[PDB]
């Protein structure tokens, strides 16, 4: 098959700045008819791919002129001038000159903004859950920047990793922020066995870790 590579895999640009994504083809994408069917899709968080540019440089009249495509043969580039928040997401290049039709892994586009502290909130198990014999303690690390962050749980002062599930969201396009949730699940039996429960987050914006906790007692 025809392998489609992309570069870079990640990218964080400041608004009003220009972003440049490259796509490398294992074979010339020039069709015997002379056309070059290489295209660029953009899949915004939680959405499906949108055709941005096709046949190397044609703008799928949907998107603006700040989106431009170029290249030839096996090398192609996409540039986004005066970047906007709505631009964040995953950019994919694709080829239709050859069957099977293939896509590249994509390139993530992040927006560069001012560091922002997380708004962590801890939530004791819910009354309904405990009746089921289960106990989950949730913690939210909302709207922070950069994406880099660390979460640490401690039961009565001791770090716990078993029964700790984590999830991160994509960069938000309304504020260029990031959010994370963490859940420490354990049986009611063990839950009612401890007094202190804590969620500890280490982030760039603060020297000492942002700690939130509560006591079952």
């Amino acid at each position: 098959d025809v392998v489609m590579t992309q570069t870079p895999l990640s990218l964080s640009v400041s608004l009003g700045d220009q972003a440049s994504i490259s796509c490398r083809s294992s074979q010339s994408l020039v069709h015997s008819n002379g056309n070059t069917y290489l295209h660029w899709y953009l899949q915004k968080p939680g959405q499906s791919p949108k055709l941005l540019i096709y046949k190397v440089s044609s703008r799928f009249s949907g998107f603006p002129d700040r989106f431009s495509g170029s290249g030839s043969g096996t090398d192609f580039t996409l540039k986004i001038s005066r970047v906007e928040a709505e631009d964040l997401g995953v950019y994919f290049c694709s080829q239709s000159t050859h069957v099977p039709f293939t896509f590249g892994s994509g390139t993530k586009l992040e927006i560069k903004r001012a560091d922002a502290g997380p708004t962590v909130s801890s939530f004791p198990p819910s009354s309904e859950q405990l009746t089921s014999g289960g106990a989950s303690v949730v913690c939210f690390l909302n709207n922070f920047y950069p994406k880099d962050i660390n979460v640490k749980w401690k039961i009565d002062g001791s770090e716990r990793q078993n029964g700790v599930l984590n999830s991160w969201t994509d960069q938000d396009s309304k504020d260029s922020t990031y959010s994370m949730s963490s859940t420490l699940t354990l049986t009611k039996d063990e839950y009612e066995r401890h007094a202190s429960y804590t969620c500890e987050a280490a982030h760039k914006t603060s020297t000492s870790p942002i700690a939130k906790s509560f006591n079952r007692a």
Binding site: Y54, F92, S96, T119, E128, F140
Partner: protein, 213 residues
Amino acid sequence: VMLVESGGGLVKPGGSLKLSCAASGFTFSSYAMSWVRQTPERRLEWVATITTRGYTFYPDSVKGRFTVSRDNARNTLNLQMSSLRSEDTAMFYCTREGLLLDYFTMDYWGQGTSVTVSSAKTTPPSVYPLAPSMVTLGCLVKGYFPEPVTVTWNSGSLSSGVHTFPAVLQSDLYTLSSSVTVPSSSRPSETVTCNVAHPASSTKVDKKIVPAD
């Protein structure tokens, strides 16, 4: 151009499934259509294409198992899948080969329909409330299978300040949380409720967030 996929679901290995793609906004019969799936690793992989005159073609990884087809009268693209295998699970989209009189290239993509091939059995979710200038509340949707699940607040009203995280798998059950932030005065003054829908198990669950005692 409107493409809406449907029929996604959970099938056991070796099982079969029939996906549909309803089309509107363009002369469906004068376009080749295709199916592309996005893997959990998020890779897009073409899976089938049908021609205007009915010619059909696919990649070897799928030959003898999938069959594209079209119902021009009903304006529907179809995808019949047999001998499904665990590595088949993915989000399936129908795409249109839009460059009318000039070679293959995908125009529009549909909303996508989710399909999980696994031995794990579908399980309803348990929806627990998460209550404590700005206040944050949440909901814990836990122990369900398979994906997906929709979470809305106040029947869709509260949009801003919402964080529905991606569900995580710890066994054969998923679990996800969704948070919502509102002005302190907003609650418990006004009610805040999370509505959770799990099509697989045919289950809807509303949970009004009340103060804890």
